Design an enzyme around this catalytic site. Structure first.
Site, PDB file in Angstrom:
ATOM      1  N   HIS A  62      -8.334  -3.870   5.866  1.00 29.10           N
ATOM      2  CA  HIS A  62      -8.314  -2.477   5.441  1.00 29.10           C
ATOM      3  C   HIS A  62      -7.674  -2.430   4.072  1.00 29.10           C
ATOM      4  O   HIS A  62      -8.247  -1.766   3.136  1.00 29.10           O
ATOM      5  CB  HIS A  62      -7.538  -1.683   6.452  1.00 29.10           C
ATOM      6  CG  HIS A  62      -8.138  -1.786   7.831  1.00 29.10           C
ATOM      7  ND1 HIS A  62      -9.384  -1.278   8.124  1.00 29.10           N
ATOM      8  CD2 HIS A  62      -7.679  -2.352   8.970  1.00 29.10           C
ATOM      9  CE1 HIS A  62      -9.673  -1.513   9.392  1.00 29.10           C
ATOM     10  NE2 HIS A  62      -8.674  -2.201   9.921  1.00 29.10           N
ATOM     11  N   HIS A  92       1.970  -1.487   1.080  1.00 28.47           N
ATOM     12  CA  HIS A  92       0.538  -1.700   0.890  1.00 28.47           C
ATOM     13  C   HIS A  92       0.096  -0.563  -0.044  1.00 28.47           C
ATOM     14  O   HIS A  92       0.889   0.338  -0.347  1.00 28.47           O
ATOM     15  CB  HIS A  92      -0.264  -1.651   2.166  1.00 28.47           C
ATOM     16  CG  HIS A  92      -0.067  -0.340   2.873  1.00 28.47           C
ATOM     17  ND1 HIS A  92       0.988  -0.120   3.753  1.00 28.47           N
ATOM     18  CD2 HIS A  92      -0.700   0.838   2.746  1.00 28.47           C
ATOM     19  CE1 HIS A  92       0.931   1.137   4.189  1.00 28.47           C
ATOM     20  NE2 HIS A  92      -0.099   1.742   3.616  1.00 28.47           N
ATOM     21  N   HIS A  94      -3.445   2.023  -1.255  1.00 27.89           N
ATOM     22  CA  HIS A  94      -4.814   2.653  -1.058  1.00 27.89           C
ATOM     23  C   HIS A  94      -5.402   2.881  -2.448  1.00 27.89           C
ATOM     24  O   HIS A  94      -4.651   3.258  -3.363  1.00 27.89           O
ATOM     25  CB  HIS A  94      -4.721   3.977  -0.313  1.00 27.89           C
ATOM     26  CG  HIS A  94      -4.003   3.858   0.990  1.00 27.89           C
ATOM     27  ND1 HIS A  94      -4.677   3.709   2.211  1.00 27.89           N
ATOM     28  CD2 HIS A  94      -2.671   3.843   1.265  1.00 27.89           C
ATOM     29  CE1 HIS A  94      -3.754   3.712   3.187  1.00 27.89           C
ATOM     30  NE2 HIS A  94      -2.546   3.698   2.623  1.00 27.89           N
ATOM     31  N   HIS A 117       2.483   2.656  -0.563  1.00 29.06           N
ATOM     32  CA  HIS A 117       3.260   3.127   0.576  1.00 29.06           C
ATOM     33  C   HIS A 117       4.274   2.097   0.961  1.00 29.06           C
ATOM     34  O   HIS A 117       3.846   0.943   1.274  1.00 29.06           O
ATOM     35  CB  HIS A 117       2.274   3.321   1.709  1.00 29.06           C
ATOM     36  CG  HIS A 117       1.491   4.584   1.486  1.00 29.06           C
ATOM     37  ND1 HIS A 117       0.305   4.823   2.129  1.00 29.06           N
ATOM     38  CD2 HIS A 117       1.684   5.627   0.640  1.00 29.06           C
ATOM     39  CE1 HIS A 117      -0.186   5.983   1.751  1.00 29.06           C
ATOM     40  NE2 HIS A 117       0.641   6.504   0.857  1.00 29.06           N
ATOM     41  N   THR A 196      -1.475   7.236   8.047  1.00 26.37           N
ATOM     42  CA  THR A 196      -2.796   7.660   7.493  1.00 26.37           C
ATOM     43  C   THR A 196      -3.945   6.739   7.951  1.00 26.37           C
ATOM     44  O   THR A 196      -5.104   6.936   7.477  1.00 26.37           O
ATOM     45  CB  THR A 196      -2.732   7.652   5.920  1.00 26.37           C
ATOM     46  OG1 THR A 196      -2.682   6.340   5.450  1.00 26.37           O
ATOM     47  CG2 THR A 196      -1.616   8.575   5.453  1.00 26.37           C
TER      48      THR A 196
HETATM   49  N1  LIG Z   1      -0.810   4.177   5.395  1.00 29.49           N
HETATM   50  S1  LIG Z   1       0.642   4.503   6.134  1.00 29.49           S
HETATM   51  O1  LIG Z   1       0.705   5.901   6.753  1.00 29.49           O
HETATM   52  O2  LIG Z   1       1.783   4.102   5.149  1.00 29.49           O
HETATM   53  C1  LIG Z   1       0.801   3.339   7.517  1.00 29.49           C
HETATM   54  C2  LIG Z   1      -0.327   3.179   8.358  1.00 29.49           C
HETATM   55  C3  LIG Z   1      -0.176   2.235   9.424  1.00 29.49           C
HETATM   56  C4  LIG Z   1       1.015   1.552   9.635  1.00 29.49           C
HETATM   57  C5  LIG Z   1       1.152   0.551  10.798  1.00 29.49           C
HETATM   58  C6  LIG Z   1      -0.217   0.323  11.511  1.00 29.49           C
HETATM   59  N2  LIG Z   1       0.100  -0.611  12.579  1.00 29.49           N
HETATM   60  C7  LIG Z   1       0.639  -0.176  13.782  1.00 29.49           C
HETATM   61  N3  LIG Z   1       0.846   1.127  14.040  1.00 29.49           N
HETATM   62  C8  LIG Z   1       1.263   1.584  15.203  1.00 29.49           C
HETATM   63  N4  LIG Z   1       1.547   0.724  16.174  1.00 29.49           N
HETATM   64  C9  LIG Z   1       1.483  -0.581  15.956  1.00 29.49           C
HETATM   65 CL1  LIG Z   1       1.964  -1.504  17.305  1.00 29.49          CL
HETATM   66  C10 LIG Z   1       0.982  -1.157  14.750  1.00 29.49           C
HETATM   67  N5  LIG Z   1       0.794  -2.594  14.495  1.00 29.49           N
HETATM   68  O3  LIG Z   1       0.080  -3.063  13.519  1.00 29.49           O
HETATM   69  O4  LIG Z   1       1.287  -3.511  15.259  1.00 29.49           O
HETATM   70  C11 LIG Z   1       2.098   1.695   8.762  1.00 29.49           C
HETATM   71  C12 LIG Z   1       1.961   2.608   7.701  1.00 29.49           C
HETATM   72 ZN   LIG Z   2      -0.719   3.670   3.574  1.00 27.70          ZN
END
Ligand SMILES: NS(=O)(=O)c1ccc(CCNc2ncnc(Cl)c2[N+](=O)[O-])cc1
Ligand SMILES: [Zn+2]
Length: 258
Positions: A62, A92, A94, A117, A196
């Site tokens: 992604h 990371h 976007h 982010h 997001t």
């Molecule tokens: N784009 S953002 O809002 O900054 C953002 C988006 C996604 C994430 C985490 C997504 N991964 C996970 N999310 C929830 N549970 C688990 Cl268990 C995992 N996981 O991977 O194990 C962190 C930040």
């Molecule tokens: Zn993000």
């Protein structure tokens, strides 16, 4: 057939596997600068990244995440709108296929070329996985990128990208100092929202800096050479991995500044 951004599986489809996509505190949002209220009870943000320990960079299909060792009390975020202390776990970006789009938050509908982010979890919940289950579990600090002068502190990240071109590749990525990615001012807007990307959990206190950082056209061009696909699959460039603005619903966006 799981989620992505392409046709067939992008943001307007996510609600089918992740119904909270149409929830009450989804992210990103457009920041209407004239409606955000200055909140003189907000504190200066405290960003303590001197002891940050990066471990690894990963193309997860992604985006790419720069991952930190969060096993000790090192790279933390506190103050601002936050109670307590939140620990850095990864960052990371976007970005767009073109410089005219790419950010997730917008400012009076303005889209920046990209958005960074820095993700932090509330230490009161003991780890990241338990934190995302709580409404105050995460604090994500969002920083806009515009194309202009290069950001020297970004270059180490840009240079390692040809080693993680495809989904599921990772590389050793130690001693990366994220203070190199911060603008001069920590003036910010803040509101309660969500991840997001799926699972889109409503666990995030969003802190979005008003000052963008500048990155070069060559820097963002290198982001766009990454791939959504795995090695030995047909090439799908990693571009336009942003979710569009979602309904603000009852929420207030607060400003730390006049
Ligand atoms: N784009 S953002 O809002 O900054 C953002 C988006 C996604 C994430 C985490 C997504 N991964 C996970 N999310 C929830 N549970 C688990 Cl268990 C995992 N996981 O991977 O194990 C962190 C930040
Ligand atoms: Zn993000």
């Amino acid at each position: 057939h799981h989620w992505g951004y392409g046709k067939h599986n992008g943001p307007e489809h996510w609600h089918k596997d992740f119904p909270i996509a149409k929830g009450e505190r989804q992210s990103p949002v457009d920041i209407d600068t004239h409606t955000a209220k200055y909140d003189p009870s907000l504190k200066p943000l405290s960003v303590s990244y001197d002891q940050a320990t990066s471990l690894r960079i990963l193309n997860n299909g992604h985006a790419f995440n720069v991952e930190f060792d969060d096993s000790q009390d090192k790279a933390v975020l506190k103050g601002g709108p936050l109670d307590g202390t939140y620990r850095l776990i990864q960052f990371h970006f976007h970005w767009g296929s073109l410089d005219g789009q790419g950010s997730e938050h917008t400012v009076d509908k303005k889209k920046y070329a990209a958005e960074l982010h820095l993700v932090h979890w509330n230490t009161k919940y003991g780890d990241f996985g338990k934190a995302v289950q709580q409404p105050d579990g995460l604090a994500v600090l969002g920083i806009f990128l515009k194309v202009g002068s290069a950001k020297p502190g970004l270059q180490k990240v840009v240079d390692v990208l040809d080693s993680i071109k495809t989904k599921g590749k990772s590389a050793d990525f130690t001693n990366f100092d994220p203070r190199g990615l911060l603008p001069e001012s920590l003036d910010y807007w803040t509101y309660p929202g969500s991840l997001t990307t799926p699972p889109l959990l409503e666990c995030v206190t969003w802190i979005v800096l008003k000052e963008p950082i500048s990155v070069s056209s060559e820097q963002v061009l290198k982001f766009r050479k990454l791939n959504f696909n795995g090695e030995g699959e047909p090439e799908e460039l990693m571009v336009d991995n942003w979710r569009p603005a979602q309904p603000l619903k009852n929420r207030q966006i607060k400003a730390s500044f006049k």
